[PDB]
Amino acid sequence: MPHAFKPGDLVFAKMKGYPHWPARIDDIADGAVKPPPNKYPIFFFGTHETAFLGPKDLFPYDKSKDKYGKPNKRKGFNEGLWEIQNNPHASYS
């Protein structure tokens, strides 16, 4: 059975106006800006952008990849697919 989301989990993350996007739940670095309550820091692969999202917008990667893990015209997307499949836990800083 599912646990709560934790840093390192891989997802497709949904934001208004964008396709479900390869991403991970990030850690918060010591000294870094914390998310609002009930929100997680989401790192989007390919774009390397961070947004704060709640679970309703987070789709676990294993279950979802056969639906959402297909090339997309949008900037950074296909780079994102590579990262999530090939080195999803690397430093992209």
- How buried is residue 56: exposed, middle or buried, by Cβ count under 10 Å (0-12/13-18/19+)? exposed
4 domain-assigned: no
Which tokens is 47 given?
A: 């774009």
Give me the CATH number covering residue 43.
2.30.30.140
Count how many domains the chain has: 1
Domain extent, residue 21, equals 10-28+38-81
51 domain-assigned: yes
70 domain-assigned: yes
20 domain-assigned: yes
92 domain-assigned: no
* Cβ-contact 18, 51 below 8 angstroms: no
- Experimental structure resolution, Å: 1.6
Which tokens is 77 given?
A: 């997307």
43 domain-assigned: yes
Kindly report the backbone phi and psi dihedral angles of residue 44, in degrees, each rounded to the nearest multiple of 5, phi listed first. -90, 125
DSSP assignment string, the chain: ------TT-EEEE--TTS--EEEEEPPPPTTSPPPPTT-EEEEETTT--EEEE-GGGEEEHHHHHHHH-S--SSTTHHHHHHHHHH-TTS---
